[PDB]
Structure formats: C-alpha cells, structure tokens
C-alpha cells in the first residue's frame, strides 16, 4: 500500500500541536499545497469519446493508472471504463474503490465492477439530489424485494435498515450467467452534503465503524475493496477514505499523517478531498475522536 506511516507519521499529541501551530488557515494552506502537487498520472481513458458520457462531471476524470477496469463487457457502449479508482488503505492495497455516483448509463458498469471486484460493501455519501440537482442515480433497487437486472447481474434489495444519518441496504447480487450470488451491503450516509463536511464527525466515525464492521463481517464469510462513492466520488469520498486510513493507522500504530494520506490518496483517486474544509475536517475529526477517546 502507498499508505505507509513514513516518513513523518505523527502521534496524536503531535497532531494536536501541529494543528494548533497551523490553525485553520495553515491547514487550509496545506490543503492548497496538496492541490498543487505535480499530478502524477493521466486521464486519457476518462477523456476518450465513448467514456466522456460515463463521467458524471467534466472536471472529475479518473486516473488511467489506478482506474478500475471492467472486463466482462457487453454491448458497444460498455467499454472497459468506469469512473472508479483503486485506492489503497492503511496497510491494505486496494482497500477502496473511489467512484462517482453512478449515472443511468453506468449503473450496469457499476454493478459489473462490484461483481468483478468482489465488493462486499458499498459506501454512498451522497443523496440522490441536492438543490433539486441529481447528484447520483438510483442505481440500486430502493425497496425490499425490488430487483433490477443489469445484464447478467440481478440486484435484489433484501432489506433496508434506517439508522441515524445512514441507511443500510442488504442487496443480493445474482450473477445469472454464472449462477452465483453474493450479498452486498450498501450504506448510504445522508448527512454529508457535497462540498461539505458531515454534520457530526462523531456520526461519520460511528458510520465508519459500522462500515468497517460490516466489511470485516462480510469478509469473515468469504480482501475486496469497499466501494466508496459520493457524487463525483472525490470530495466526500477522499475525506471518508482519508479519515478511515488515518484512524486505522492511529488505532494500530498510534500515528497518522493527514497530509501524507491525502497526498498519496490523490495519486490514486485523483482530486480526493475537494475543499479545504473537508481537508481540515480530517484533522478536526481525528482530534475530536482523540479527545472523545481520552487520547488527548
């Protein structure tokens, strides 16, 4: 994984001092420093005709070097392309697939990716619409017993649990060609607006724990990536994954480095973390968690 502690992992108390020294504006300047880093990679597949329409946003391509390729294609319009990026996690290659909110014309691509990448957990940190603007397609059967066939992948909703700030949807993916079935858990976090931070870092971290627990549970029953998406799949997605990585490293090694995490993440899911507020949120969420956990 690109996410190794080195070379400047910080303890939680050093993180407190670091944030105190830099303050919000210093952290914002640090985010700008990240935004300016020489972008290593190309976006040719994203920009190819045929694939342009598969990008929700003209300004959010995905890197060639880390993209999730679709193998079992069908139909001229299904290229190997989905706007989806393999993302390392803490001590884990390809812990996530960061991807955009599926478009009607990429629903089937999305589920193909979920099938091919053996995904067990989908994390969605977007509503379908914000400001009456569609931000994500309704790419999964919303109501229990509802199903949608995406070619040879039939997705059936097995139940929806409505929690505080998120919804947990149990999906069956039935590969009807291979006669194979898999349960995928779909988590939709509802209180994290685009370009924003979650209303409560504690709610996000609890959600992170729920996601982790479900990933761990599903895996104990087979490591596949967790699909993490928002609308573009970069801002809230990068923030979610970065927080996850930092918290995981904090838990295991007592250290973290937000700047390293985000910088490295942006070499995999380009443009990860989309506002300085989200970048600052990573720090503040960690510090708030640290306080709540008596670590500081």
């Amino acid at each position: 994984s690109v996410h190794v502690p080195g070379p400047h992992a910080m303890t939680i108390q050093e993180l407190v001092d670091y944030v105190n020294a830099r303050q919000k504006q210093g952290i914002y300047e640090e985010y700008e420093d990240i935004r300016r880093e020489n972008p290593v990679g190309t976006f040719h597949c994203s920009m190819s005709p045929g694939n342009l329409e598969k990008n929700r946003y003209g300004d959010v391509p995905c890197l060639d070097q880390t993209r999730v390729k679709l193998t079992k294609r069908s139909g001229h319009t299904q290229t190997d392309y989905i706007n989806a990026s393999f993302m390392d996690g803490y001590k884990q290659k390809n812990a996530y697939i960061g991807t955009q909110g599926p478009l009607e014309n990429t629903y089937r691509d999305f589920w193909l990716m979920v099938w091919e990448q053996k995904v067990l957990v989908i994390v969605m940190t977007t509503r379908f619409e914000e400001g009456g603007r569609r931000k994500c397609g309704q790419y999964w059967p919303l109501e229990k017993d509802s199903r949608i066939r995406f070619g040879f992948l039939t997705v059936t909703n097995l139940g929806v649990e409505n929690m505080n700030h998120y919804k947990k949807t149990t999906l069956e993916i039935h590969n009807t060609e291979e006669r194979q079935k898999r349960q995928v858990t779909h988590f939709q976090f509802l209180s994290w607006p685009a370009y924003g931070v979650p209303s409560s870092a504690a709610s996000l971290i609890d959600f992170l724990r729920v996601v982790r627990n479900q990933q761990s549970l599903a895996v104990s029953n087979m490591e596949p990536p967790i699909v993490v998406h928002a609308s573009a799949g970069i801002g809230r997605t990068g923030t979610f994954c970065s927080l996850d990585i930092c918290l995981a490293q904090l838990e295991e090694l007592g250290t973290l480095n937000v700047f390293q995490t985000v910088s490295r993440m942006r070499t995999q899911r380009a443009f990860s973390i989309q506002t300085p507020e989200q970048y600052y949120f990573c720090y503040k969420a960690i510090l708030e968690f640290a306080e709540k956990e008596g670590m500081v």
Partner: peptide, 7 residues
C-alpha cells in the same frame, strides 16, 4: 458541461 467544482 456538468462541473463538480463550480464558482
């Protein structure tokens, strides 16, 4: 024409 980051 759909942009994620707009001013």
């Amino acid at each position: 024409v759909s942009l994620y980051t707009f001013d």
